[PDB]
Amino acid sequence: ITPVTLANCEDEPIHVPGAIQPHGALVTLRADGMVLAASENIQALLGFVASPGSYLTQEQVGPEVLRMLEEGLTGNGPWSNSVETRIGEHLFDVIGHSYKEVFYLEFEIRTADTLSITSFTLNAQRIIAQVQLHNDTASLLSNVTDELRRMTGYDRVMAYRFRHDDSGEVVAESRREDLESYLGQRYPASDIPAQARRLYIQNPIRLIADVAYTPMRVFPALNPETNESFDLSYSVLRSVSPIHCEYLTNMGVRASMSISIVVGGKLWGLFSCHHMSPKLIPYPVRMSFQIFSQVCSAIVERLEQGRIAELLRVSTERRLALARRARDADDLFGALAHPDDGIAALIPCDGALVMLGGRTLSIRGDFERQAGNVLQRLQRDPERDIYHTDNWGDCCGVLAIRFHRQESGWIFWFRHEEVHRIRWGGKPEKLLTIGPSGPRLTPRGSFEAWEEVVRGHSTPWSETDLAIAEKLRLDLMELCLNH
Template sequence: MAAPRRVDLQNCADEPIHIPGSIQPHGALIFLSDAGLVEGWSANIAAVTGREPALGQPFGALGLPDAVTELIQECSATMIAGEGPAMVAAVTIDGRDYDCVVHAHVHRILVEFEVRDVGMDEVAQFAIKAHSSIDRLRRQRTVDGLLETAVRQVREFTGFDRVMAYRFRSDDSGDIAAEARRDDLVPYLGQRYPAGDIPPQARRLYVLNTLRMIADVGYRPVSLLGAAREGAPDSEPLDMSFAVLRSVSPIHVEYLQNMGVAASMSVSIVVGDRLWGLIACHHMTPKRVPYSVRMAADVLAQVIASTVQGIEAREDAALVEHAAQVRTSLVESLLLEEDPLEALVQHGDGLLESAHAQALIVGQYGRVVCRGIDRALGEAVAAALPADANDILTYGCVKEWPDAVRPLLGKWAGLLGLPFDPPTDGWCVLLRTEQVEEVAWGGKPDKSMSGPMGERLTPRGSFDAWHETVRGRAHPWEDGILTHARMMLGELTRVSNARRAQTEATRAQLLAMLGHDLRDPLNSINMAGMVLERTDGGSNKGTLGKRIQSSSNRMQRMIGQVLDMSRIDRGLSLGIDLQPVDLAALACDMVEEARLAYPTIVYDVHATGPAFVLADSGRLGQVISNLLSNARQHGEPNHPIVIRLAPQDGQAVLDVANAGSPIAPETEATLFNPFKRGSLNNPRNRTGMGLGLYIAQQIVREHKGEIAYRHENGNVVFSVRLPLAPRQAS
């Protein structure tokens, strides 16, 4: 057999505990090939069978009791893909009682003889007690009550000094949720043990083989002897994952010794293929528990697992039912309510309850509505959300939040975000408060680097409660709530898409009306104004005609801006027809037009000469007109508007400047956005919708140019850069 590897700092995490190469000494073992030939045995086998087996010997020649031979034959006959479940028989050899356990694993048959110190009558009494315990467990309706009953019942029919029920968390640390103990022992109830106390390979074995017994922690292991099956180039270590006598890790032995434990039994509670919990039994002196009694405890653990599953299923079903009601009611409101944010806030209580959250933030189009949280903080949280999210977003602790918002969080630590309409920055955000937790660890949760086995990882020596205050964490988002959140996100997204489709259809109808039904009447009104102006007979008809023309022209411009924005939003070109245009002459024409309309405004034009660009003169005139209009509306009174044009580095640079204070940074960031808040109810621009700069930027971009804002020498300056026509550029 391959010698067991040394367990040290280098390979502790990969310790091969399923192939220890030895067994515990309160029994003996023989293992056979799937053909029934001897492949190996424990060094103490002769003490049981009275003879030393030979490599390759048929099991029928070993002189084993008939009951054992029958088990081996049945195991071999029922083996599937090299695996076979455990079968047990009570046998007596040379006046000594044994439980013989036979099972198959990895195409080998393992035959184990475990010494039994009590008679079958006493074992039967244990079984009766276990059956009564199972009935009591099935009647429990809460997890806490279930575990309390379990530890009392297991201690009663096994006789261990201490029986504890661990419940594992999502991070694999475990809390002692229930305990039954001898009165003189220090209580461990409520203590938490770190995930590292059960390394991954041990956790895997706890799921595969749900019961583990160490009769004497201070035992001396018995080595396995023999060789691999014939024809194999090297020895194959015996996989003892399901063996009852498997020797245990020296680190685990040391761990138990540091706790003052002399015998141990653990029974796994496996729920949904995950190690949900553990019944851990400790005794302060060596102790053997008959195999049949251990199996009763194992059945008890399966009943616990089934009951836990039932309790959690009922809780999940109640959550699902409530969540479904909230979703249905919310979707109905969203389909009827004009403002989706108001609908979300109206259903805030249901959303918070179904997610076990304490605050709600909903936002869309830059607007934020809060419930249970300060508005300023809600806006800061909304501003820190990622722009490209398309699935639920979760934070469980403060460290996971973006750096910019962490100092503002205060008591908040957990976030569950639903990006229901990314194009409009639509978010529904649920928050959980920080759960300040006083953790009583079972000893300081670390390991030292030296010990009785030399330079190696050593378990902690003290298991007195070691207290730690954990801050900055919220209660983790449960799987059921995350499932509900994804379903909610799907419903919200579908509603948002339906609303957007309806809005697009309505907008198309409105634009058609603006483009056709309104333009014709406006043209008629404009013509009537011109007639009134020309037929002025000394009355006020001429003034009235000019006013009608001015108003109708302004309405025409507004309609044109809306139609232009619609083309841009749909990804269409504005219809640019490029021809050589003298930008200087065009700018002078636009300034003269502005002087006639606003004779009190001083326009100061500086142009070094012609500046030809390839442009659409109508669209470029629209840009210049918009910049002159902005300068007139926002400039300081009694200050000139300065227009400068000069070639620079192969570009024509047109600056339009007006006296004024710098634009605030938050406003500057949205200067070229449509429907800016600053454009609404602006006393200097009551009819503006904020579309002018947005459209101007698109026009300049279609001319392969740039438009930008700067502030210099007390002036607000908008600068347009366009490539000079090839001939002038050269």
Template sequence: MAAPQRVDLHNCADEPIHIPGTIQPHGALVFLSSAGLVEGWSANIATVVGSEPALGQPFGALGLPQPVTALIQECHDTMADGTAPATMTALDVGGREYDCVVHAHGGRVLVEFEARDVGMGEVAQFAIKAHSSIDRLRRQRTIDGLLETAVRQVRDFTGFDRVMAYRFRADDSGDVVAEARRDDLVPYLGQRYPAGDIPPQARRLYVLNTLRMIADVGYTPVPLLGAPDAAPLDMSFAALRSVSPVHVEYLQNMGVGASMSVSIVVGCRLWGLIACHHMAPKRVPYSVRMAADVLAQVIASTVQGIEARADAELVEHAANVRTGLVEALLLEDDPLDALVRHGDGLLESTHAQALVVCQYGRVVCRGVDQALGDAVVASLPAEASDVVTRAGVQDWPDAIQPLLGKWAGMLALPFDPPSGGWCVLLRTEQVEEVAWGGKPDKSRAGPLGERLTPRGSFDAWIETVRGRAHPWEDGILTHARMMLGELVRVSNARRAQTEATRAQLLAMLGHDLRDPLNSINMAGMVLERTEGGSNKGTLGKRIQSSSNRMQRMIGQVLDMSRIDRGLVLGVELHPVDLAALACDLVEEARLAYPTIVYDLHTTGPAFVLADAGRLGQVISNLLSNARHHGEPNQPITIRLATQDGLAILEIANAGDPIPAETESTLFNPFKRSSLNNPRNRTGMGLGLYIAQQIVREHEGEIAYRHEDGKVVFAVQLPLAPNR
């Protein structure tokens, strides 16, 4: 049969470790075809059967003891798709005890004879200890407690010098999370081992065959013999399978004389390992190893149960958060404020530490400053339909990396792409001191020649890992996608509701225009019939008032339509004296409403780059709001001042504070509180929304506050240069 290839770290990931062509020397092997004919054997088979078999010889002519031939026949009878599970019997050959293991794989029957150096009575005692260990494991309620108990129990009934529990990370590196050892050995607890220590094909074998034993790391392999042109024997499930020389060298560099590993497989993935090391050669009987394998299955089942309970708790909590958030979004006017108010639940259910939400260009932050929030939003992709994640600083655009500070991880949900709606969750950087099991690099010199070899030292090598957050867990990503689906449905429902409201308001607008139009028509008719009458002045005022109402309504609808289509309102910037503009508009208001006191205070000219018409629209809207919502017979105060390069215009009226639930939606269109307001029956909830858009197009801000019994709206605009 073909000789094994020479390997080093250049090609060990491609090494066919399942067909090594050799076995470990503490046993012998013969393999048969599906018809029960001899196809090959190990070079030392004569130590068990007395002589070397012949190719094509029936297994019944090998002179094997009856219990062994019975197992072989049973394996043939139960073979399905070329495989059959392992069965074992004990036998004595020339006063030496063996465990005979028979199984089928790849259409061949493998018969392994493994020498045992302890009697069956002692093996039975091991089995009793193992059963007791299983009972202890089943009572554990935490993964840490489970693994700590497991390493102690496995060491107790196997006698290894060191037993470690590895737990693998998402990147396939593994941490030693529990350890039971001989007192004089250097502890490995807390050390991490890189993913490269277990090549992919070895990881696959760990899942397929969950137990592997190397009785003597310094062994000389025994070759397999057979027809020169025969296909290599697949030994994936063989107990005596020889191991890679690279792995042997790895263990020798650790000072290990014998090893046993038991896989912990959860959900068809390699979750962890129970790794056993002995500083001298050591054999563990097959029955005891099988007990350890059962122990690992109990560990896997218990881990699965613990993780399932944790996942169920997360799912329940996340569902409650989603339900509460959806209810709030359906009932409230401002999605961003609803998201921020439910921030505690969002952060807790995703294990995040900060929240940034945005929509229609507005950015609201919780846990980070506004500048970083704006930068985070600016870094989001233009189009996305699924959650967007970033695990570390290196995943962010280069321009924003210097601004991140302690933040590294991101989970972003595009809940309303048409309006630029995002819900962004952030995680802080997890500065981690990693104690690697030896510096994870490769040296050039080794006992097998000038080649890349495993590292020679396994003393803890400390590395500080920065710029990475804790990875987003699968359960949290699933919850995030479910939440995204709910938020998208709510956004679509709100959009449909807005469209229906818009249609209703347009219909109402058409209805409300009838009254002023009728007034104009009637006034015109009266003027025509009473051309010389004394009531021309009154009728003229009525015509002007009705026309202004129509013009205001139509203008707001047109502005709203432009904003809704993503268009700017369009401003032509020229130097404008805000003081003079405010004086003109206040004078117009005094003439139109002579019973109202307008108290104007300015500190002189205040030139800004502005569109006078649009800015006049903002001031007129604020004066109108003060007139409609202020307390009767109380003055309206207008103050204009300059400070720190800004012109600050404040319009105040006496009144109670705006309720919190209304304050959060002041600048939203189509507010419920504005519709059918008895003090402003024709209001459509568009004025402040349009005013805010105009001010922002002037690179300014508009804000509300309540101060000294007055409702105050303040507009801040940058002063024009060289003024």
């Protein structure tokens, strides 16, 4: 019965809302096919009253439907299927699935004049051609963002990248003129709490037909079998958190639809479609996106590792240049401090320090004091050959490696505090009408929430950055020992 406030919202059970969106009806069955619960609108949408204890009957739901249901009813492992069928006055999409051991049948009115197979195929071809045309991982995102809008007619579609700390960044955008831009927006991991994030990962597509909707409750609330709520995780019609709904209306959005990009076990980022008026996307089309989601995820994965590959390649090429120079010139300092192949170019940094013997070369600033303090901190830890941190002198980020012990051969890279890369301003943008929860649920409030998180922090060191440092360290050890 608990109200969901700003304090609660992190722990909101959004998977068991026990209600569904109004653009469809829902019937929940148990293993034997016996009805356990239904949305309060089954009668109003489909001509009949589903009742707990009942079993579904032909042409109160039609034949092919039970035909489908029986197949999944007798199959081990998460059944999933859909049928198209006429029930009374209308034809329906009857998407059905089984999660836990409860079976779900979802009913959407089908208004499309097209054959489903071809509608599905047509859109799949169109939206994944965008995945064959681009080598830049960012062109991919940018282009499919522009294309998703062309296909769906959404007012605004955005592409979101998720950082290491699960903070988001709007990296692409295609929007109707009128609308303010959110390009370069940054938001915290708290604006998509655990359960919501778990769900985007498990579900390629989420659709919100109308944010201003009144939910259609499924009765009864609790599954008699367990005396605990129905887990609508894989339910297409599952209802929305009032918090998110308030957020979206603060923005002035009325319909959403998001396509996930999952790589590893991580939500790599999603495409979020917004509309200013309510909007619906037919089932077969959503399936076009679902399959797309899986392929795009695959290509983004490769494109990303193709990116790291090239980073490693030019790094070694520079380690080669470095090895070449060092042996022939015989001062390392000159080699390391080289403007372009220098260490400052090896790994993205705002500065670097080279330190062998008693001599100190600070390149791109005065870093001698910091390096001294960092080194003192490592006093307590004589065995550390590598040190790094984004919390901390005057530079937040530090990556230090040791290549000579006795003569204190050290290398440092430094990073300043992370800064909002792109920022809007210039003319006060319009007044958002703000709900009861407060300004926290506006983009402006989200950004501020993000600042408070990152400030005091430099950008984390790449998986890649550390790998390079490690290779460099090996190089110099080799050199110093060798000659």
